[PDB]
Design a protein around this ligand. Structure first.
Ligand code: MG
Ligand code: MG
Ligand code: MG
Ligand code: MG
Ligand code: MG
Ligand code: MG
Ligand code: MG
Ligand code: ZN
Lengths: 225, 129, 267, 102, 64
RNA sequence: CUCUAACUAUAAAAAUCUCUCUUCUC
RNA sequence: AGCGCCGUGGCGCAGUGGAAGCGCGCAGGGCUCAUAACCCUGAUGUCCUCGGAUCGAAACCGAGCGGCGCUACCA
């Protein structure tokens, strides 16, 4: 189609010859330390390529970093911070679900439970954690809904807040992520809330990094290699 | 992993002029931007499945020659306030990528969802065609 | 013999503009000849024919006459062209028709030269026309410069210098215009001697009239004096008329009056 | 006359409800008189499932489903045949069309 | 180029089109009979007949 | 005396209308 | 008076350079139960007048006519 008239308000080259492949290395928390590849323009001084990479973020499926298929719904945002040349170092930047799992997960005739929390980890990491849970029809049920009274929501949500904030304000990000990969926090949540209401399908979604202190080179070194 | 050089499809599929635009796995470097309107003329077949097929084949050729072998696919409807439904060309483009050599992994929907805010275009009674 | 392309190749290029003549409309549309490129056929089927709803079939096609056109696809094996007419914006159509007018005009002169010397028109286009279109963007502008400057032909390899001579003759006879540069001078004097000042002013002004460029300051009104000259290069009249302005200001800044410029020199 | 003792809305004693916008023509309608449909379907059509399964790594991919609850104004709903005009005695039956494929 | 393929029709999935002239055909590619497509045929046809195609992956929707 | 799975792809435009009303009883 | 234009098929526009153009008109038939809208098809012109260049002028231009917008009534 020629459509556009040419509202102007052939210098042809091979643009991808000026580009190169760099490997991806993930923190030791995940089993699969190598993630994939990334295309970067060649190192031209004064706008070096190394500056070009630093700050790149990426979405990677958690199965690809664990190899298992019980993690078929989670994804991790990784942020590159270090450059080695022909190999790069990425830091954990956040966690999230897949949209499909979450939309399938919310259902008619059951009240969902959401909890926000802003926390400070052991070192400096200003984080925010989102918790999603759902009520449960007990295995005797003939009253064929599973609604919860508002007071029970306030109680359960306060429990969610205390558990998340207590767990997270103890450890650095790495220990937190290693706790997260098998969701010990999930199990403890359903354990501490089952007294109030059955509260099925508890999970932790969309864990976000909000602030990091300066550079922390040594820890990132320790997490890769 | 036998060195499948992953890429990402990031299909955008509206009621009008579906988009296929491969970037790096980081989602920063463009590969084969070629769109739905590139390979169709009458501008009405912009959303037609055949448009998606043709753009998909062009992307497949360029992608295979640059080096990306496996492609991660994300389908995006118009999203935002607008209509929430995947474009008719999305299925055709996805099928066409699936056939043409490039391997597929981790397809998910990326269509944004608001919290029903920023009142939708149309007025009260809306489009009264 | 009337034939041959107007542009470089024989085949039209993708996503370009042409202007075609219609001769015949069978069922699916009109496959028609092109007047911007060569003489091969190219089809417009009914879907890409009328921007408005398809009501008048013969009224909007008018078999036998010319119309703007846009090429979509080219089959570079046999000579088949896919083409449309809806898809040319209102802004576009005018440049489309201007390019056609230019291409048509450049055609007839070389047609005359080829007929006279019995040389194929293809040869004349290959030798003189195409390098001119490369040098100057278009050949008609090249001929306009040829009227002004003889150097534009320097670098071309004629099939014979007799072609050059008769082409000079026919271009000078056919393409001849020398745009008129006009201006308006405001005499705002409240002074004592102004008539003699104006007499001396036009004496000085018309003393600069060259053999090829003659400046006359005609009277149309007392304050407004209209300056008329014919510039052949369109680049000397401005300076000569600014010289006239300098003359008039120098004359009247000492007689006591005031004079000002209303309209400077312009084509 | 009184055609709809329920007045269609299914409101019955709440004063007023927030209005949603038609996903076809953006006709603002109260959320209750706002006939709704679940868009529970596989992300890919059944005509290409194998074309993905064999031509993709990770054998036995989950094949995710897309989820949506679209809102239809009654005008677009009756025009696009999701809702159907029903006989006067048939207007009683609130039961769905009994599992379209049984 | 002529990448035509022969596909044997195994089922006539009813008829469609504006005037009712074109027919649904479930074709099965003669090369690699494992694959099946639905397409749209002008003119009468029965099961077991074969068709010649230029486009192969185009699974056109119902004409309307 | 016994059980919750299938999901599609529709909107070009179309204004107006002169008489004439005639009935039920074994 | 000079300038900026114009000179029509019934009216309006148009290219000016290859030589009767389109809409609006009107006549006729077509759709319509029928009218209007809409389809299609016609019979009419010194593209103002004299010239000069041109293979060719209605067209490029001049030497003149008529109608105009200004400049301005320009002892
Ligand atoms: Mg309407
Ligand atoms: Mg309507
Ligand atoms: Mg009523
Ligand atoms: Mg009534
Ligand atoms: Mg209702
Ligand atoms: Mg009350
Ligand atoms: Mg009336
Ligand atoms: Zn609607």
């Amino acid at each position: 189609a020629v459509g556009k008239n040419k509202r102007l308000s052939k210098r042809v080259v091979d643009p991808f010859t000026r580009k190169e492949w760099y490997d991806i290395k993930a923190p030791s928390t995940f089993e699969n330390r190598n993630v994939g590849k990334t295309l970067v323009n060649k190192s031209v001084g004064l706008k070096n390529a190394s500056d070009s990479l630093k700050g790149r973020v990426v979405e990677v499926c958690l199965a690809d970093l664990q190899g298992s298929e019980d993690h078929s719904f989670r994804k991790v945002k990784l942020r590159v911070d270090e450059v080695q040349g022909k190999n790069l170092l990425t830091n954990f930047h956040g966690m999230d679900f897949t949209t499909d799992k979450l939309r399938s997960m919310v259902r008619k005739w059951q009240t969902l439970i959401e909890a926000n929390v802003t926390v400070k980890t052991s070192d400096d990491y200003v984080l925010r954690i989102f918790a999603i849970a759902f009520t449960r029809k007990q295995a005797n049920q003939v009253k064929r809904t599973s609604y919860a009274q508002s007071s029970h929501i306030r109680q359960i949500r306060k429990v969610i807040s205390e558990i998340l904030t207590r767990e997270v304000q103890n450890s650095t990000l790495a220990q937190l992520t290693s706790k997260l990969i098998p969701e010990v926090i999930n199990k403890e949540i359903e354990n501490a809330t089952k007294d109030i209401f059955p509260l099925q399908n508890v999970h932790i979604r969309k864990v976000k990094l909000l602030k990091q202190p300066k550079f922390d080179l040594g820890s990132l070194l320790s997490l890769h290699g | 992993d036998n060195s499948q050089v992953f890429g990402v499809a990031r299909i955008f599929a509206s009621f009008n002029d579906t988009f296929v635009h491969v970037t790096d796995l980081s989602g920063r470097e463009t590969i084969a931007r070629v769109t739905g309107g590139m390979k169709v003329k009458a501008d009405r077949d912009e959303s037609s499945p055949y448009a998606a097929m043709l753009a998909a084949q062009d992307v497949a050729a360029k992608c295979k020659e640059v080096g990306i072998t496996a492609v991660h696919i994300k389908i995006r409807a118009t999203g935002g306030t607008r209509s929430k439904t995947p474009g008719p060309g999305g299925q055709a483009a996805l099928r066409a990528l699936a056939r043409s050599g490039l391997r597929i992994g981790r397809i998910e929907d990326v269509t944004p969802v608001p919290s029903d805010s920023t009142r939708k275009k149309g007025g009260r009674r809306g489009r009264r065609l | 013999t009337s034939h041959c392309r107007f542009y470089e190749n024989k085949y039209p290029e993708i996503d370009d503009i042409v202007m075609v003549n219609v001769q015949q409309i069978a069922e699916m549309g009109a496959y028609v000849k092109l007047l911007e490129y060569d003489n091969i056929e190219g089809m417009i089927l009914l879907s890409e024919l009328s921007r408005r709803r398809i009501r008048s079939i013969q009224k909007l096609i008018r078999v036998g006459k010319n119309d703007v056109a846009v090429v979509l696809r080219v089959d570079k094996e046999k000579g088949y062209i896919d083409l449309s007419k809806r898809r040319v914006s209102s802004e576009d159509i005018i440049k489309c028709e201007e390019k056609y007018q230019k291409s048509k005009t450049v055609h007839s002169i070389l047609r005359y030269c080829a007929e006279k010397f019995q040389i194929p028109l293809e040869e004349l286009y290959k030798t003189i026309a195409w390098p001119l279109s490369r040098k100057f963007g278009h050949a008609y502008e090249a001929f306009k410069l040829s009227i002004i400057d003889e150097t534009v032909w320097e670098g071309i390899e004629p099939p014979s210098k007799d072609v050059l001579d008769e082409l000079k003759n026919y271009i000078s006879k056919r393409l001849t215009p020398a745009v008129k540069i006009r201006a308006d001078v405001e005499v705002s004097c409240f002074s004592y001697e102004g008539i003699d000042a104006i007499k001396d002013a036009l004496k000085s002004a018309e003393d600069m009239s060259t053999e090829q460029m003659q400046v006359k300051v005609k009277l149309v009104a007392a304050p407004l004096y209209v300056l008329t000259t014919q510039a052949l290069d369109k680049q000397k009249g401005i300076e000569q008329l600014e010289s006239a302005i300098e003359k008039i200001t120098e004359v009247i800044t000492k007689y006591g009056g005031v004079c000002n410029i209303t309209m400077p020199p312009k084509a | 006359p009184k055609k709809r003792a329920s007045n269609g809305r299914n409101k019955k004693g709440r004063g007023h409800v927030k209005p949603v916008r038609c996903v076809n023509c953006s006709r603002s309608v109260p959320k209750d008189k706002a006939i709704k449909r679940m868009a529970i379907r596989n992300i890919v059509e059944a005509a290409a499932i194998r074309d993905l399964s064999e031509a993709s790594v990770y054998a036995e991919y989950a094949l995710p489903k897309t989820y949506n609850k679209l809102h239809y104004c009654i005008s677009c709903a009756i025009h696009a045949r999701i809702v159907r005009v029903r006989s006067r005695t048939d207007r009683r039956i609130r039961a769905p069309p009994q599992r379209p494929r049984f | 180029k002529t990448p035509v393929t022969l596909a044997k029709v195994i089922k006539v999935l009813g008829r469609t089109g504006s005037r009712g002239g074109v027919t649904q055909v479930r074709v099965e590619f003669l090369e690699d009979t494992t694959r099946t497509i639905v397409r749209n045929v002008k003119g009468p046809v029965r099961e077991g007949d074969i068709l010649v195609l230029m486009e192969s992956e185009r699974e056109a929707r119902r004409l309307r």
